[PDB]
Amino acid sequence: MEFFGESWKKHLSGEFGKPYFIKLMGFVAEERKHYTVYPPPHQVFTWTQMCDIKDVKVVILGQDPYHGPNQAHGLCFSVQRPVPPPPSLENIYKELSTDIEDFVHPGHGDLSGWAKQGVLLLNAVLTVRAHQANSHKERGWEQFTDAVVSWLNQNSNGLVFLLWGSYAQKKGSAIDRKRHHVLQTAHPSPLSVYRGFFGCRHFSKTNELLQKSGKKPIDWKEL
Numbered sequence: 001m002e003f004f005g006e007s008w009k010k011h012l013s014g015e016f017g018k019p020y021f022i023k024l025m026g027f028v029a030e031e032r033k034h035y036t037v038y039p040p041p042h043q044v045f046t047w048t049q050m051c052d053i054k055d056v057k058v059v060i061l062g063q064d065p066y067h068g069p070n071q072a073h074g075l076c077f078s079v080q081r082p083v084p085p086p087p088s089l090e091n092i093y094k095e096l097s098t099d100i101e102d103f104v105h106p107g108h109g110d111l112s113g114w115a116k117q118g119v120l121l122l123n124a125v126l127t128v129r130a131h132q133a134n135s136h137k138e139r140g141w142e143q144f145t146d147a148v149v150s151w152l153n154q155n156s157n158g159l160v161f162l163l164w165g166s167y168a169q170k171k172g173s174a175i176d177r178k179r180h181h182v183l184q185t186a187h188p189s190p191l192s193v194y195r196g197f198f199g200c201r202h203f204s205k206t207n208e209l210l211q212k213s214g215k216k217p218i219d220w221k222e223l
């Protein structure tokens with residue numbers, strides 16, 4: 001379908017004709033008739049547009065999109081200019097400031113620079129009704145993003161999965177740990193950031209894992 005990266009479409013378009021996905025599309029379409037639904041249709045699949053599916057090297061799993069105006073744009077945790085970084089992303093930046101040498105908080109919260117380097121920023125649920133968190137849960141999105149995680153698990157090699165919080169750790173609980181790397185900690189949200197996220201050093205740990213497997217590390221400063 002429209003706005004779906006070609007290499008991603010080549011491997012995942014078998015989901016589109018399945019009954020669960022057809023029903024999911026009808027629900028989202030009906031929701032957009034009566035409510036503002038985030039992100040806009042052309043940004044629901046931004047995570048397929050930043051790099052080829054075979055160039056993915058790091059996977060950060062999220063839950064729900066941001067539900068405020070101009071926030072969500074199809075990459076988890078990210079916000080387009082000139083929206084200020086929400087609290088979870090500010091804590092991510094704060095951890096980077098102690099984890100990565102000379103990291104610079106750029107002021108904005110657009111994580112496209114990471115996505116183009118092969119950092120997949122995948123929410124488990126890809127739409128949300130405006131101002132109503134989790135409103136589109138359990139409608140088909142989870143099964144679809146499960147298929148994405150399952151494809152990467154089976155087809156890629158040496159990925160680093162960053163699983164922050166209980167929801168993400170469950171979604172990635174079937175990842176082959178002999179084939180891929182799994183780092184787990186608390187969610188960077190202010191509700192849980194002091195429960196393990198601060199000090200987790202996942203970003204430097206990710207690059208060491210990448211380099212040891214002969215892959216180019218992420219420049220977390222390139223934003």
Ligand SMILES: O=C(O)C1=CC(=C(c2ccc(O)c(C(=O)O)c2)c2ccc(O)c(C(=O)O)c2)C=CC1=O
Pocket residue numbers: 062063064065066067068071075076077078086087088123133165187189190191192
């Ligand atoms: O701060 C806002 O404005 C805001 C924040 C959230 C999230 C949230 C959840 C999953 C995500 O994937 C993302 C993302 O894509 O960044 C963000 C959130 C905030 C506090 C929490 O505690 C938890 C939690 O515990 O799971 C989650 C959602 C809508 C919002 O409007």
